[PDB]
Design an enzyme around this catalytic site. Structure first.
Site, short mmCIF file in Angstrom:
data_model
loop_
_atom_site.label_atom_id
_atom_site.label_comp_id
_atom_site.label_asym_id
_atom_site.label_seq_id
_atom_site.Cartn_x
_atom_site.Cartn_y
_atom_site.Cartn_z
N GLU A 198 13.77 -29.46 -0.82
CA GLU A 198 12.70 -30.17 -1.46
C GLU A 198 13.04 -31.66 -1.74
O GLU A 198 12.17 -32.52 -1.67
CB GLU A 198 12.30 -29.43 -2.74
N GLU A 238 18.82 -22.65 4.05
CA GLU A 238 17.41 -22.58 3.76
C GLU A 238 16.58 -22.54 5.04
O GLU A 238 16.55 -23.51 5.79
CB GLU A 238 16.99 -23.82 2.97
N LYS A 251 13.81 -24.46 -10.38
CA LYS A 251 12.97 -25.55 -9.93
C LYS A 251 12.27 -26.27 -11.07
O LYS A 251 12.81 -26.36 -12.16
CB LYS A 251 11.96 -25.10 -8.85
N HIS A 298 19.04 -29.95 -1.64
CA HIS A 298 17.97 -28.95 -1.54
C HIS A 298 16.81 -29.45 -0.65
O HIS A 298 16.39 -30.61 -0.75
CB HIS A 298 17.41 -28.59 -2.94
N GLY A 324 8.23 -23.09 4.77
CA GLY A 324 7.12 -23.98 4.97
C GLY A 324 5.95 -23.46 5.76
O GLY A 324 4.89 -24.07 5.72
N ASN A 359 17.53 -20.75 -8.93
CA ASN A 359 17.03 -22.10 -8.95
C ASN A 359 15.64 -22.07 -9.63
O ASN A 359 14.61 -21.72 -9.01
CB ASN A 359 16.97 -22.66 -7.51
N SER A 408 13.22 -16.46 1.20
CA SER A 408 12.61 -15.60 0.18
C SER A 408 13.42 -14.36 -0.11
O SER A 408 13.67 -13.53 0.77
CB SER A 408 11.21 -15.19 0.60
#
Lengths: 248, 249
Positions: free
Chosen positions: B96, B166, B12, B94, B172, B10, B212
């Site tokens: 985000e 995720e 982004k 996603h 976060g 991804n 990650s």
């Protein structure tokens, strides 16, 4: 009257088979007078459009951008657009404000960043039908414009273009009348003249958006404070050529 | 027994020709001998450049988002436009978009249903935040998110669906999820699918980890029973991505 602009916002539409013949038509069209043409394809179509649109009077714009690259899956930043050679962007379109939560502040943030980054910006403003009926048209569009201006410096205005699109004229087929339009344009220009001056106000381009077509363009352009158009559906058709000529 | 893995990149909202061409050249040069499906998700702006240059046979290009129909939605790109261009993979839901751009469970479910109907392969993202995890709501939050899309799909559509977990709680807060923490949620997701949708659907469904991932931890994560690949962020913009793909061997 400053140099006119005829901008085409293709919105979320397009296909290669559709777009190739349209671009050829724009390439074949020749315009004698001084006018700035802009076409705004979807991100995905900016590459093929940049590659084929050879007409010197045209510039390509993005339909939206976010202020910074990074962890924002799905979006495209101002920086990614600049690196690709795009220097024009449409910001604060009514459809973004209504469906995707862009508040007056988020639009003001985008515009400020886009100007800092050297872009030419078409900032959209406009009232909804209920806001018109409630008699709040002036309060709404000047509050929208005030938000953007509080962040701008005097010289950024050379790269600012204002587009007035009444939300009740979008996709509705109900165009405003030259007098309704003219009425708002003149209010917006008057506001700018008292905050920033006659020099800045006189050079400012205020475009009209909302059901524009070859049939009503010329009459709309005749108004004193209308400097061109932001065209929707009619821009994906050859008629777009007659709309540009109506800016003579 | 584990189904074919997937390593997805991804990118982004990042990129430029200068950075991307070398990276595509590196991926084009790499050869993977095992069965694995790789996917790269460039911004809309860079999908044409990527399509014209990407030649690695194990790769497919994906879009990072889409809306259900073309029309007057300034700034968006529809599933129909992507299909016309030849793109048949897409990432939806996603974290985000859910956090910054108001995508709710229902909106994501509609997007996935329409995507499956149009013939796309869909990577649907699911995940709980720090607040939800603290409150003991991990299972409620992710099974809800998943049930919302399950309700809109027919059994057959599941063959074109991929799930990505995720750990938004970790992402976060800057913490790092251990492989045990990731397997924990992947196991509860496979359990639900196995009992609500079918043992046949559960055995072939790919569940990817999307926290990650680096060339360092990739192999330890893939060793867990219910992890079938990765949805990689920042590291997918580096040559290291080749090693992450190798980790699914």
């Amino acid at each position: 009257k400053p140099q006119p602009i005829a901008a085409a916002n293709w919105k979320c539409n397009g296909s290669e088979s559709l777009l190739v013949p349209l671009i050829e038509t724009l390439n074949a069209a020749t315009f004698d007078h001084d006018v700035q043409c802009v076409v705004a394809p979807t991100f995905l179509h900016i590459p093929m459009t940049k590659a084929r649109l050879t007409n010197p009077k045209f510039q390509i714009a993005a339909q939206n951008a976010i202020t910074r690259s990074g962890a924002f899956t799905g979006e495209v930043s101002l920086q990614i657009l600049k690196d690709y050679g795009i220097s024009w962007v449409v910001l604060g379109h009514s459809e973004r404000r209504l469906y995707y939560g862009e508040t007056n502040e988020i639009v003001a943030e985008k515009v400020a960043q886009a100007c800092a980054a050297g872009f030419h910006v078409i900032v959209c403003v406009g009232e909804t039908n209920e806001e018109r009926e409630a008699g709040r048209t002036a309060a709404v569009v000047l509050t929208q414009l005030a938000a953007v201006a509080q962040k701008l410096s005097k010289e950024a205005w050379s790269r600012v273009v204002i587009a007035y699109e009444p939300v009740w004229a979008i996709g509705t087929g109900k165009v405003a009348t030259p007098q309704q339009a003219q009425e708002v344009h003149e209010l917006l220009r008057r506001w700018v003249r008292s905050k920033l001056g006659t020099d800045i106000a006189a050079q400012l381009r205020i475009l009209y958006g909302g059901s524009v077509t070859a049939k009503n363009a010329r009459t709309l352009y005749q108004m004193r404070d209308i400097n061109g158009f932001l065209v929707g559906g009619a821009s994906l058709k050859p008629e777009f050529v007659e709309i540009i000529e109506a800016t003579k």
